Design a protein around this ligand. Sequence first.
Ligand SMILES: *[C@@H]1O[C@H](CO)[C@@H](O)[C@H](O)[C@H]1NC(C)=O
Lengths: 49, 47
Amino acid sequence: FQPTYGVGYQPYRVVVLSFELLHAPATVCGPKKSTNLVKNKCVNFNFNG
Amino acid sequence: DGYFKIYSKHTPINLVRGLPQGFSALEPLVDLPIGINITRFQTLHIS
Ligand SMILES: *[C@@H]1O[C@H](CO)[C@@H](O)[C@H](O)[C@H]1NC(C)=O
């Protein structure tokens, strides 16, 4: 790899993400949605299921 | 089912020989989302 190397020949960093589904409990997941707390109004809620 | 749990409790005692005629719950302390099909165990030794 050289700086004068043209496109398609320059050093490109590559990270492969391999996903697997073992029967063990899932650990890595996504973030929350938060929203905002509102009171004294008939609403619906999803507090941790 | 793949969860290893450990509860705990501490108390001061003065009787020497046996477990006292007392009652006390064991509040949960630590949980682990890992599973190994343990069959045996052994308590360590100190010096
Ligand atoms: C559960 O026990 C079985 C024995 O039938 C063993 O093959 C398996 O490896 C155990 N599971 C774990 C996570 O060690």
